[PDB]
Amino acid sequence: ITVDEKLDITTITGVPEEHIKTRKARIFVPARNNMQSGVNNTKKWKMEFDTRERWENPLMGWASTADPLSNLVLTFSTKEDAVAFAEKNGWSYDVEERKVPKPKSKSYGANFSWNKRTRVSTK
Amino acid sequence: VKPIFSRDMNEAKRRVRELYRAWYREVPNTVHLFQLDISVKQGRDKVREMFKKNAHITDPRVVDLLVIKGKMELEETIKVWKQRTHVMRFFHETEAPRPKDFLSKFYVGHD
Amino acid sequence: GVRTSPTGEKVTHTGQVYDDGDYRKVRFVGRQKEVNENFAIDLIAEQPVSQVGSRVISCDGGGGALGHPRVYINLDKETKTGTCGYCGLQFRQ
Amino acid sequence: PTVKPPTARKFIWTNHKFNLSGTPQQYVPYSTTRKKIQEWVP
Amino acid sequence: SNLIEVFVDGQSVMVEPGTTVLQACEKVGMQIPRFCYHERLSVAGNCRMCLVEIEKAPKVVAACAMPVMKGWNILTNSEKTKKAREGVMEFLLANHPLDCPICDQGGECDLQDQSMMFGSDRSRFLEGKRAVEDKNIGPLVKTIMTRCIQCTRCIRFASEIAGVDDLGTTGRGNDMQVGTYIEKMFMSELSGNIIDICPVGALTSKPYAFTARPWETRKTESIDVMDAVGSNIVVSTRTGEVMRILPRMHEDINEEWISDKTRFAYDGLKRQRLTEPMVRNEKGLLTHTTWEDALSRVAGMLQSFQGNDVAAIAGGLVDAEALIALKDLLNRVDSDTLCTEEVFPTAGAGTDLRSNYLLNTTIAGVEEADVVLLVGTNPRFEAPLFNARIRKSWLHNDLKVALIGSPVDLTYRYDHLGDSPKILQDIASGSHPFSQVLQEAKKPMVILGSSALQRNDGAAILAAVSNIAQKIRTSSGVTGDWKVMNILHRIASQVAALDLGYKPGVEAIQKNPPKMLFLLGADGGCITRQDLPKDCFIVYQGHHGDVGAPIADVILPGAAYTEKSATYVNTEGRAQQTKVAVTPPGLAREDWKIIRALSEIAGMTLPYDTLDQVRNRLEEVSPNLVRYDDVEGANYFQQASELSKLVNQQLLADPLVPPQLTIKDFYMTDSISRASQTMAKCVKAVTE
Amino acid sequence: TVRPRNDVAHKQLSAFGEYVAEILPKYVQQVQVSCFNELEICIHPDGVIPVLTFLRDHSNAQFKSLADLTAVDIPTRQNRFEIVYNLLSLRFNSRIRVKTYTDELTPIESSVPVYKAANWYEREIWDMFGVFFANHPDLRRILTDYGFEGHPFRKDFPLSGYVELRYDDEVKRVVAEPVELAQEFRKFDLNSPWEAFPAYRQPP
Ligand code: SF4
Ligand code: SF4
Ligand code: FES
Numbered sequence A: 001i002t003v004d005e006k007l008d009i010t011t012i013t014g015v016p017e018e019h020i021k022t023r024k025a026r027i028f029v030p031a032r033n034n035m036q037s038g039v040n041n042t043k044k045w046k047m048e049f050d051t052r053e054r055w056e057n058p059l060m061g062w063a064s065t066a067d068p069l070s071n072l073v074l075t076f077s078t079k080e081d082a083v084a085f086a087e088k089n090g091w092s093y094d095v096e097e098r099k100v101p102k103p104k105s106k107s108y109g110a111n112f113s114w115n116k117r118t119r120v121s122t123k
Numbered sequence B: 001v002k003p004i005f006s007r008d009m010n011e012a013k014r015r016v017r018e019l020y021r022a023w024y025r026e027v028p029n030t031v032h033l034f035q036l037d038i039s040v041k042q043g044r045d046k047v048r049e050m051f052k053k054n055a056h057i058t059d060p061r062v063v064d065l066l067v068i069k070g071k072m073e074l075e076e077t078i079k080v081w082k083q084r085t086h087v088m089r090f091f092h093e094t095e096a097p098r099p100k101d102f103l104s105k106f107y108v109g110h111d
Numbered sequence C: 001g002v003r004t005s006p007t008g009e010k011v012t013h014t015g016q017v018y019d020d021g022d023y024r025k026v027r028f029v030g031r032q033k034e035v036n037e038n039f040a041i042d043l044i045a046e047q048p049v050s051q052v053g054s055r056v057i058s059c060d061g062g063g064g065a066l067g068h069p070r071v072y073i074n075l076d077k078e079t080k081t082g083t084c085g086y087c088g089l090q091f092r093q
Numbered sequence D: 001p002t003v004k005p006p007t008a009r010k011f012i013w014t015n016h017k018f019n020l021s022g023t024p025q026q027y028v029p030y031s032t033t034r035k036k037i038q039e040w041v042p
Numbered sequence E: 001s002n003l004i005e006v007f008v009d010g011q012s013v014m015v016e017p018g019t020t021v022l023q024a025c026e027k028v029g030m031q032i033p034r035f036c037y038h039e040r041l042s043v044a045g046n047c048r049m050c051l052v053e054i055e056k057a058p059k060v061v062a063a064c065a066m067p068v069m070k071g072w073n074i075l076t077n078s079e080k081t082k083k084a085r086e087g088v089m090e091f092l093l094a095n096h097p098l099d100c101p102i103c104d105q106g107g108e109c110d111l112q113d114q115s116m117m118f119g120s121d122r123s124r125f126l127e128g129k130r131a132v133e134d135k136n137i138g139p140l141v142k143t144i145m146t147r148c149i150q151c152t153r154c155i156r157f158a159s160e161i162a163g164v165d166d167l168g169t170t171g172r173g174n175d176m177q178v179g180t181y182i183e184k185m186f187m188s189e190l191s192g193n194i195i196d197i198c199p200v201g202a203l204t205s206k207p208y209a210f211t212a213r214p215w216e217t218r219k220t221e222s223i224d225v226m227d228a229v230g231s232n233i234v235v236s237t238r239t240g241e242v243m244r245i246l247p248r249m250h251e252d253i254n255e256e257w258i259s260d261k262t263r264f265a266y267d268g269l270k271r272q273r274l275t276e277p278m279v280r281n282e283k284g285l286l287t288h289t290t291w292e293d294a295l296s297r298v299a300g301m302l303q304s305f306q307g308n309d310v311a312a313i314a315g316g317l318v319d320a321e322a323l324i325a326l327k328d329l330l331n332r333v334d335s336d337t338l339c340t341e342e343v344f345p346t347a348g349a350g351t352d353l354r355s356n357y358l359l360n361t362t363i364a365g366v367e368e369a370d371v372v373l374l375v376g377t378n379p380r381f382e383a384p385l386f387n388a389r390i391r392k393s394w395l396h397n398d399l400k401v402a403l404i405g406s407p408v409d410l411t412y413r414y415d416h417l418g419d420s421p422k423i424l425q426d427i428a429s430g431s432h433p434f435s436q437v438l439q440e441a442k443k444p445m446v447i448l449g450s451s452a453l454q455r456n457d458g459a460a461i462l463a464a465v466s467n468i469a470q471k472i473r474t475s476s477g478v479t480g481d482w483k484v485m486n487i488l489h490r491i492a493s494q495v496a497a498l499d500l501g502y503k504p505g506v507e508a509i510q511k512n513p514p515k516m517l518f519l520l521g522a523d524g525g526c527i528t529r530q531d532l533p534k535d536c537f538i539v540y541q542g543h544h545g546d547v548g549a550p551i552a553d554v555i556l557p558g559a560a561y562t563e564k565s566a567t568y569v570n571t572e573g574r575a576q577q578t579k580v581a582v583t584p585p586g587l588a589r590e591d592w593k594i595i596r597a598l599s600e601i602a603g604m605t606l607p608y609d610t611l612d613q614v615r616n617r618l619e620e621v622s623p624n625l626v627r628y629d630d631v632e633g634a635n636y637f638q639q640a641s642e643l644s645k646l647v648n649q650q651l652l653a654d655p656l657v658p659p660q661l662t663i664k665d666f667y668m669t670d671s672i673s674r675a676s677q678t679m680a681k682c683v684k685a686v687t688e
Numbered sequence F: 001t002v003r004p005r006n007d008v009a010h011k012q013l014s015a016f017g018e019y020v021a022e023i024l025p026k027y028v029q030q031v032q033v034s035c036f037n038e039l040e041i042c043i044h045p046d047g048v049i050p051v052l053t054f055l056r057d058h059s060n061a062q063f064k065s066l067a068d069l070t071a072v073d074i075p076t077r078q079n080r081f082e083i084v085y086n087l088l089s090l091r092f093n094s095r096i097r098v099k100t101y102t103d104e105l106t107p108i109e110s111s112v113p114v115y116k117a118a119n120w121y122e123r124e125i126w127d128m129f130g131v132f133f134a135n136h137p138d139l140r141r142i143l144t145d146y147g148f149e150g151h152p153f154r155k156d157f158p159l160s161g162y163v164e165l166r167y168d169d170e171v172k173r174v175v176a177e178p179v180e181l182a183q184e185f186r187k188f189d190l191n192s193p194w195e196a197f198p199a200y201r202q203p204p
């Protein structure tokens, strides 16, 4: 009883001060490190916001920042869910496509070739 | 079948009218009983600038949630809790903001 | 140990002379600057190079008491004495 | 100084200093920043 | 239709015949611990860590070696597989030094992450530990061979992909040293990738050395400038300072490697850069001034002069947001006469049509090529990533590559067809050493370098490529969707300027001298005191000012590639968006904000409020630079070839020789890497 | 073997995974989870009051006590909040979890008539998360300031806040609020490569 179903776009009610409209979100899956050859940081979406101004503090030596919303990393299972959450918050998003590793047929038999020039020299 | 919070579409706007009616009568109570601070006229202008930000009415759920939130942040000063002029001061007076301009913000330091 | 600046304030472990136009010098007006008398750079060369009979020797501070992971150093090179990553101690032969 | 003496290291100070207070020779902070240099010359 | 059904822990998976056990496990989501195997490199069963037991077999086989046949139940979490991984890990760490505090690699280390998860908690080890004498390989790569696990991955990297052949195994058993026996100073292209190839802390960056640990620095994705290919590399920042730049895996940008000149030169942006706006004083020398006062002195001349007597010469480290703003400040306020620093032909519809401006064939499309007929250019000096792609296309598939126009050192074979512009004219007709191979080919491609194009014979080299490409592809060569002609621009901004609508070359400024020139990031020798025969009033706007900065009246500081967040065009024709990693030093501002504030100070104000407003205006001028990381091929190549052939020009007598034709030549170039502590140390040791 | 823990009462406790499920409403049950002698049941938001009247004074399951009323905030799902009612039996000596799901802004049926302790935890969720509860008497801010913006826990906004810095400035009595500058939090990018655990990885 009493449903009152209304279809409309999501809006921010519990929102902070004027900083959401200026800052742009970059919902992109984190790339694997150059040295570490393991895929575990990948296959999970991360919504990291663009970094603002940073300067060395006159108090000591640390680099203090005025920008509050900067040091947060969110997790998402689907690309459609991350895009819907960004619209729900209010901030404009620039989504990047996931770069999947291409399947390359790396066979051991190619190392000892006769006709082909793909023969491995000195082991 | 679906939750409606408090009101459906039209009655939610009348709850805002009910909220504005109650909060307009409470600004003399926040000066004489509480503290003078600024002015009675500027206190009523402080109400208008708060509701002008909420010009984006699109859902009955969003409006009603703001009414329930409004029946706590503005209900705080009716049954007077500990604020003592330091708290319950919505308008920024201590800090001076930089105007939105391509020549003004670039000269000072922004983005 | 370290050379004193023409401005006044003494240099630290690294070459850290404050600029003449820099305002961050008021801090040391009135109250003294804490600079260590013993400089670590000069203390490395002060310690004598020890002689090794065998090819490979293991470096230690003093067992489990003095903090040092057991690192084995190769001593095949004649020129430039072999040193561990932790101490400034050098080894020959 | 009677039964068990501390071992010599030739690095520790011979004379012990008093408490650091509002008096001169008090603690002060500093940074190891070499800073990004700017090049401008006629 | 060539698919085999096999079981990983009892779960069904369909695989192509010829694929390895590890390749089949990647399909379901499993990842077997590895040390030798790499996605780009070849296969070797050295370490024997990727052991995985398949049921009904006496011996455990490696994931590297075995190709998957019909009917295998690969058990990853059996009693023997766990004991195999725990066993070998103890052998790998028995003769490996306790160096984790002094090691340059921290959390990124492959031995650390794997030994904690797969290896045993405690070691049986009592006595041993071998020690290896370290060999000084180069000033760019620090080498501590004590920590090396003799995995044989760098040796394969230098032999198969880099093609230098210096590293090799010497000795037997414990006494095996990886590296060059003759103590040769190893310095070549792609040498800044061998630090990332090595899984352990054996090979590390000497300029970076010790600054931050992998977990401490916050990673940020950006497209690398000052390179033709435009490789993607995640720049790491440790509290408002760029510490290390490491490449990320990408299909379009060659491979999972960055250029040697791009990766090692991280300190170049931090050593010398303009911090405060400098205006020319009454005495003569440039002095630091306020931002409101320095802009007013620049706006006083800019608003006063009108017509064709105002022209901007920009090229080098220029962005797409800078290109859209400078064109809106010049064409709207006065007459448009904006020029590019890099010389490019525009006589026969050069700027018009996207097929002539940029390379038609994709950067990844070099692998699917029958024969590469490259023009007089050095691939080793200009774009090391593209030279690696051409070598990988030569190693994996049989494709004869020909490079005509001055012989140079290359990783591939040879097959040079002389060294003359007349030989290129003969190649268009029925040639004897060439043309016959070009006629009988599946998909031939001709790559024309910008190194020879920026000379006296600009139109002559362009007509030979259009005449040669038009006679080959349209007649019998191309059979469907295939590219014939390609142009790889040396400068980073040259590909972006041609697409936007800038006049290429310094000929526009040479024909009509301007009164006041606002040269945005002037690096190349185009504008000088002798070149401009009037009062200077030159405005220099760009990060790292060493050349061009002394010959300026009012210099305004700008942000580098790591500073400003704006789009950049690739050689293939792809717009890659770069993100801001660190704040600009001093009072320096962004490229899009610098031109908008100049218009606001003057009378005529450009329609721009934010970065989104500048992106919308850039989308209207060119739709190709609107979509990020999406490249589209240009149509009508035969129409462009007919328009270019109408112009008549005589061929030059001098051979088509590249300006950079040395190993030491590609160290200090394009002024951005010239003011560096790392690059100058490398270049001095390259000759000595 | 020394070092791991042994379980034997798992099968005896798994009977409730059938018992409450055999009541069989689409209104209540949905999904039942049981691991390391603890039960997790996730229940549709429309029914919470009729669910908690059950397991209370029932002859077979007599809980009577509510210890925890924790809420899980997770941005991955369309239903953002996973409110967990943790119950404890003193007669049978067993623990059960009554999980629910609520999206961005939808009221759930609050357990004020069922439990007299719930109201204090119900005010805590409305503060930290912003999840409004229907049929609740006197919903007030406890942990937050009397002039606080947003909801303190929500993963949308930073750890440092927005009105963090408070000066005793030029004004004699008024303490400043809207200044947003603070010392930088070193967010360490620590996340180990290679998946350490089998029987957890899902195919795409
Ligand atoms: S390579 Fe890895 S395990 Fe070896 S010392 Fe370095 S950090 Fe430690
Ligand atoms: S130096 Fe590194 S890559 Fe080369 S064999 Fe040793 S461990 Fe492998
Ligand atoms: S990784 Fe397969 S044998 Fe070394």
Ligand SMILES: [Zn+2]
Pocket (backbone or CB within 6 Å): C059, C060, C061, C068, C084, C085, C086, C087, C089
């Ligand atoms: Zn030592």
